[PDB]
Write a protein that binds this ligand. Sequence first.
Ligand SMILES: CCOC(=O)c1c(C)c(C(=O)N2CCN(Cc3ccccc3)CC2)c(C)n1CC
Ligand SMILES: CCCCCCCCO[C@@H]1O[C@H](CO)[C@@H](O)[C@H](O)[C@H]1O
Ligand SMILES: CCCCCCCCO[C@@H]1O[C@H](CO)[C@@H](O)[C@H](O)[C@H]1O
Ligand SMILES: CCCCCCCCO[C@@H]1O[C@H](CO)[C@@H](O)[C@H](O)[C@H]1O
Length: 337
Amino acid sequence: ERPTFYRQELNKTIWEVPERYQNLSPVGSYGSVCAAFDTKTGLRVAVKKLSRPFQSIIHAKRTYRELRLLKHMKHENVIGLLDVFTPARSLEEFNDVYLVTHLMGADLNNIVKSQKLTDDHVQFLIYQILRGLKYIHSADIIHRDLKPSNLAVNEDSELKILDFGLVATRWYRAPEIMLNWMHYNQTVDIWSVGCIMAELLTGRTLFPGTDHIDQLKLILRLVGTPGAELLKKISSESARNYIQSLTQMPKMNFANVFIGANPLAVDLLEKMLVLDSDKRITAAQALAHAYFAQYHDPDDEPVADPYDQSLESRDLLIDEWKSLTYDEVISFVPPPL
Ligand SMILES: CCOC(=O)c1c(C)c(C(=O)N2CCN(Cc3ccccc3)CC2)c(C)n1CC
Ligand SMILES: CCCCCCCCO[C@@H]1O[C@H](CO)[C@@H](O)[C@H](O)[C@H]1O
Ligand SMILES: CCCCCCCCO[C@@H]1O[C@H](CO)[C@@H](O)[C@H](O)[C@H]1O
Ligand SMILES: CCCCCCCCO[C@@H]1O[C@H](CO)[C@@H](O)[C@H](O)[C@H]1O
């Protein structure tokens, strides 16, 4: 049986939602987000109304990708769906899509505040990010924009990685993404984790570049200029030649950079923040690192089904994408709760 819907404007947008969801309150604005109370479960929830989901091919395509991705993500440390709804009663009237998930209420800046965290707390937060990333990476997905705003956290420090979130974003990006390499390893996400971890431990941004080149300079100053093995892996002649033209600079000792940190934390940052992405520690490897001894449970670090990215990278008409998104709404089964 179809739920009864009600409407109300919030910030120039009409939202029509099932009666289930009450006390809609804007928090941010791909789409706009209201906190809300789900009366059926007793849970506070975030409700996201997609923006103009089927007005162009590319909005339709994006809509389908987000819905399908979120339906497939079922893991404690990755954002997933509690509900998906449309007021529409048929394909012909299908114009709006709303996604529901657990309200976390905060992201990593909010909990953190630029103050340094205890080692135990840093351990717990990074452990959860890695646990989520193992899962994402097992599905052959690369996040590529891991940063503090893309990590939702509740007040008990429980964390979920977000597709898109609600402090420069460049600050956490892997060097190869700053230079537009088009082949990427999953360990681009591991670089981002090293950056976040450093910050949590020291209370300061690791690489706070004022712009792109300043950022690459700050990176090279910590990790050193590329060695002989790395230089051999550069396809672009102009890049190769530029890099060789640079004054060699040694890698810094991270003990001198992270004074007084847990030596296990220092050891793990050295394995995350290596310039050559082939040499960076993987999510699964990092989870087994001794830094996480109080949290690591090799029987509770689940892995995903491979994810068919080819279906969302098609070139289809709006009405095809719209109909496919419609079937995903209908086929949705809410999770055990
Ligand atoms: C003070 C800064 O406040 C915050 O950072 C903050 C965060 C991170 C959250 C939160 O829990 N999110 C972020 C947005 N997705 C939307 C969504 C994604 C997918 C499906 C459905 C909805 C849900 C998880 C909230 C409510 N806030 C308060 C605005
Ligand atoms: C919920 C966890 C899913 C994380 C991955 C989804 C984030 C989508 O953001 C990214 O879009 C980029 C283009 O902007 C692509 O290059 C990336 O591979 C893709 O992950
Ligand atoms: C300023 C020059 C230093 C930046 C070099 C970044 C090195 C990243 O490392 C490189 O990642 C590539 C992109 O995914 C991979 O193809 C290579 O195997 C790996 O060596
Ligand atoms: C491998 C990618 C090659 C990128 C070449 C970047 C060259 C930028 O060049 C540098 O940029 C800055 C000025 O904006 C200054 O810090 C330096 O003096 C300047 O030489």
